[PDB]
């Protein structure tokens, strides 16, 4: 948790929750953070956490200062080579090509087709960004025009590419007509989808939404529990436990027409509580697998070098080389070697017992 | 009962598109029989799926699993579902 909390801390400093941080002094505190970092065992854990963290900032423009961000990437590269800050820099360059890409799509649209909404998209290279597939989401009709219209646009852009939409990261803005006032809702794309459903009926059960938005209930439940937090939607009982009362596939959902709020633009797109856990668990699995890759890499750097070596000598070299990034577990390197043979990168010398040789 | 869309900010991942509609282990169409069953001529040759979403004839991925353990197409161990 220590190397993780340090990264979370960095987020704190380079994240803007609207309050401007004195520039110069943060440079000192970044350079301070960098010293408590060089004294970290599992560097690689900090890396995964600080990337996934730099990820959320870039995608949502939530970055305190353009300058500070790259300031930390020159320190980190100087303190762990260009492997450590490879994917990082690619994410910056990616956001920039995206910026450029978007405009290039507006123009093509400016001259040809109409748009019913204000569309804005961030294409990111499927490798560098620590994100994952959505959850089998059924696309609302109004958005769909902007979907197909872009997917088709992109087909022209490139020869063999493919787009993978990450709806669990997409947001947007709804405008309300069915309430006392005129509100501008800032809602996640999951939200938008269930809200547009109440453009015909005014109540469905938990089972009817899962059938019309294809949202896996697991994630549909956590979302509705946010749509009940804001008094936008309500159930038959206006007294139930707002936090503890789990829903059922048969519990109804009602569009509360008595919606009142002391402000015109609201933010209902809040981080749900099961998120800071679930995303942590997944990042841990990605780290565990990342280490396995680092290791295979070592095994190959080493075997490639000394064309033949005994198991025990191999293990010792691998530990030597990785010791600076983390504290490898023996059973793992065993497994990495094994996999490497199934992959035909190295084989066992017949006659010899535990002597391996690299397959040129 | 009326909501409207003013803005939508999307996020997407671009990758190269690899059309693999064969079995990686015996090399012929998933939707037809595996190499070993065409050796036997004349329903019980199904396709097994992994948590990794990769698919191979159940027959191949068995013989293959005899000597190896990490999915023919990724770095993770093979897991049914
Ligand atoms: Zn096959
Ligand atoms: Zn067969
Ligand atoms: Zn696989």
Swiss-Prot record, chain A:
Cross-link (Glycyl lysine isopeptide (Lys-Gly) (interchain with G-Cter in NEDD8)): 304
PTM per Swiss-Prot/TrEMBL: Neddylated; which enhances the ubiquitination activity of SCF. Neddylation prevents binding of the inhibitor CAND1. Neddylation leads to structural rearrangment in the complex that allows interaction between the E2 ubiquitin-conjugating enzyme and the acceptor ubiquitin. Deneddylated via its interaction with the COP9 signalosome (CSN) complex.
Stretches assigned to the Cullin neddylation domain: 290-350
Domain of life from the UniProt record: Eukaryota
Tissue expression from the record: Expressed in lung fibroblasts.
Quaternary assembly: Component of multiple Cul1-RING E3 ubiquitin-protein ligase complexes commonly known as SCF (SKP1-CUL1-F-box) complexes, consisting of CUL1, SKP1, RBX1 and a variable F-box domain-containing protein as substrate-specific subunit. Component of the SCF(FBXW11) complex containing FBXW11. Component of the SCF(SKP2) complex containing SKP2, in which it interacts directly with SKP1, SKP2 and RBX1. Component of the SCF(FBXW2) complex containing FBXW2. Component of the SCF(FBXO32) complex containing FBXO32. Component of the probable SCF(FBXO7) complex containing FBXO7.
Function: Core component of multiple cullin-RING-based SCF (SKP1-CUL1-F-box protein) E3 ubiquitin-protein ligase complexes, which mediate the ubiquitination of proteins involved in cell cycle progression, signal transduction and transcription. SCF complexes and ARIH1 collaborate in tandem to mediate ubiquitination of target proteins. In the SCF complex, serves as a rigid scaffold that organizes the SKP1-F-box protein and RBX1 subunits. May contribute to catalysis through positioning of the substrate and the ubiquitin-conjugating enzyme.
Family: Belongs to the cullin family.
Free-text note regarding domains: The Cullin neddylation domain restrains the RING domain of RBX1 in the E3 ubiquitin-protein ligase complex; this restraint is removed upon neddylation of the cullin.
This protein's name: Cullin-1
Organism: Homo sapiens (Human)
Gene (UniProt): CUL1
Residues of the full protein shown: 417 to 776 of 776
From Swiss-Prot, chain B:
Top EC class, one word: transferase
Keywords: Acetylation, Cytoplasm, DNA damage, DNA repair, Host-virus interaction, Metal-binding, Nucleus, Phosphoprotein, Transferase, Ubl conjugation pathway, Zinc, Zinc-finger
Annotated effect of mutating residue 52 to A: Strong reduction in ligase activity
Outcome, altering residue 54 to A: Strong reduction in ligase activity
Zn-finger region bounds: RING-type: 34-75
Tissues expressing the protein: Widely expressed.
Subcellular location(s) per record: Cytoplasm; Nucleus
Single annotated GO MF: zinc ion binding
Residues that coordinate or bind Zn(2+) 1: 23, 26, 57, 60
Biological process according to GO: cellular response to amino acid stimulus; cellular response to chemical stress; cellular response to oxidative stress; cellular response to UV; DNA damage response; MAPK cascade; negative regulation of canonical Wnt signaling pathway; negative regulation of insulin receptor signaling pathway
Binding site for Zn(2+) 2: 34, 37, 45, 59
Pathways involved: Protein modification; protein ubiquitination; Protein modification; protein neddylation
GO CC, one annotated term: Cul5-RING ubiquitin ligase complex
EC number: 2.3.2.27, 2.3.2.32
Binding site residues for Zn(2+) 3: 52, 54, 71, 74
Catalytic activity: S-ubiquitinyl-[E2 ubiquitin-conjugating enzyme]-L-cysteine + [acceptor protein]-L-lysine = [E2 ubiquitin-conjugating enzyme]-L-cysteine + N(6)-ubiquitinyl-[acceptor protein]-L-lysine; S-[NEDD8-protein]-yl-[E2 NEDD8-conjugating enzyme]-L-cysteine + [cullin]-L-lysine = [E2 NEDD8-conjugating enzyme]-L-cysteine + N(6)-[NEDD8-protein]-yl-[cullin]-L-lysine
Quaternary structure and interacting proteins, as annotated: Component of multiple Cul1-RING E3 ubiquitin-protein ligase complexes commonly known as SCF (SKP1-CUL1-F-box) complexes, consisting of CUL1, SKP1, RBX1 and a variable F-box domain-containing protein. Part of a SCF(SKP2) complex consisting of CUL1, RBX1, SKP1 and SKP2. Part of a SCF(FBXO3) complex consisting of CUL1, FBXO3, RBX1 and SKP1; this complex interacts with PML via FBXO3. Component of the SCF(Cyclin F) complex consisting of CUL1, RBX1, SKP1 and CCNF. Identified in a SCF E3 ubiquitin ligase complex together with HINT1 and CDC34.
Domain notes: The RING-type zinc finger domain is essential for ubiquitin ligase activity. It coordinates an additional third zinc ion.
Protein's job: E3 ubiquitin ligase component of multiple cullin-RING-based E3 ubiquitin-protein ligase (CRLs) complexes which mediate the ubiquitination and subsequent proteasomal degradation of target proteins, including proteins involved in cell cycle progression, signal transduction, transcription and transcription-coupled nucleotide excision repair. CRLs complexes and ARIH1 collaborate in tandem to mediate ubiquitination of target proteins, ARIH1 mediating addition of the first ubiquitin on CRLs targets.
Family, per entry: Belongs to the RING-box family.
Protein name: E3 ubiquitin-protein ligase RBX1
Gene, per the UniProt record: RBX1
Residues of the full protein shown: 20 to 104 of 108
């Amino acid at each position: 948790k220590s190397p993780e909390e340090l990264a979370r801390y960095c987020d704190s400093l380079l994240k803007k929750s609207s309050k401007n941080p004195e520039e110069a002094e943060l440079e000192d505190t970044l350079n301070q953070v960098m010293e408590k970092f060089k004294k970290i065992e599992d560097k690689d854990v900090f890396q995964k956490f600080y990337a996934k963290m730099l990820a959320k900032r870039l995608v949502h423009q939530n970055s305190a200062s353009d300058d500070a961000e790259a300031s930390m990437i020159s320190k980190l590269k100087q303190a762990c080579g260009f492997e450590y800050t490879s994917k990082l820099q690619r994410m910056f360059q990616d956001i920039g090509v995206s910026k450029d890409l978007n405009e290039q799509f507006k123009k093509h649209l400016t001259n040809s087709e109409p748009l019913d909404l204000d569309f804005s998209i961030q294409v990111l290279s499927s490798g560098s960004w620590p994100f994952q597939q959505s959850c089998t989401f059924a696309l609302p009709s109004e958005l769909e025009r902007s979907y197909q219209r872009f997917t088709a646009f992109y087909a022209s852009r490139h020869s063999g590419r493919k787009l993978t939409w990450l709806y669990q990261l997409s947001k947007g803005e709804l405008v309300t007509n069915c309430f006392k006032n005129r509100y501008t809702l800032q809602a996640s794309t999951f939200q938008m989808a269930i809200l547009l459903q109440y453009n015909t009926e005014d109540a469905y059960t938990v089972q009817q939404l899962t059938d019309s938005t294809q949202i896996k209930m697991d994630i549909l439940a956590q979302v509705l529990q946010i749509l009940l937090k804001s008094k936008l939607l309500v159930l038959e009982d206006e007294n139930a436990n707002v936090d503890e009362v789990e829903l059922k596939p048969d519990t109804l959902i009602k569009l509360y027409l008595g919606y009142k709020n002391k402000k015109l633009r609201v933010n209902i797109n809040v981080p749900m509580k099961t998120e800071q856990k679930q995303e942590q668990e997944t990042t841990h699995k990605n780290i565990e697998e990342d280490r396995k890759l680092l290791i295979q890499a070592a095994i190959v750097r080493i075997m490639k070098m000394r064309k033949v070596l005994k198991h025990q000598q191999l293990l010792g070299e691998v530990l030597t080389q990785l010791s600076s990034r983390f504290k490898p577990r023996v059973p793992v390197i065993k497994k990495c070697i094994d996999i490497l043979i199934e992959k035909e990168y190295l084989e066992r010398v017949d006659g010899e017992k535990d002597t391996y040789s690299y397959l040129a | 009962k009326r909501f409207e869309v003013k803005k939508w900010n999307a996020v997407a991942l671009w990758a190269w598109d690899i059309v693999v509609d064969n079995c990686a282990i015996c090399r012929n169409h998933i939707m037809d029989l595996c190499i070993e069953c065409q050796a036997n001529q004349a329903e019980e040759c199904t396709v097994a799926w992994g948590v990794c979403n990769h698919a191979f004839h159940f027959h191949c991925i068995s013989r293959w699993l005899k000597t190896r353990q990490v999915c023919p197409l990724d770095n993770r161990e093979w897991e049914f579902q």
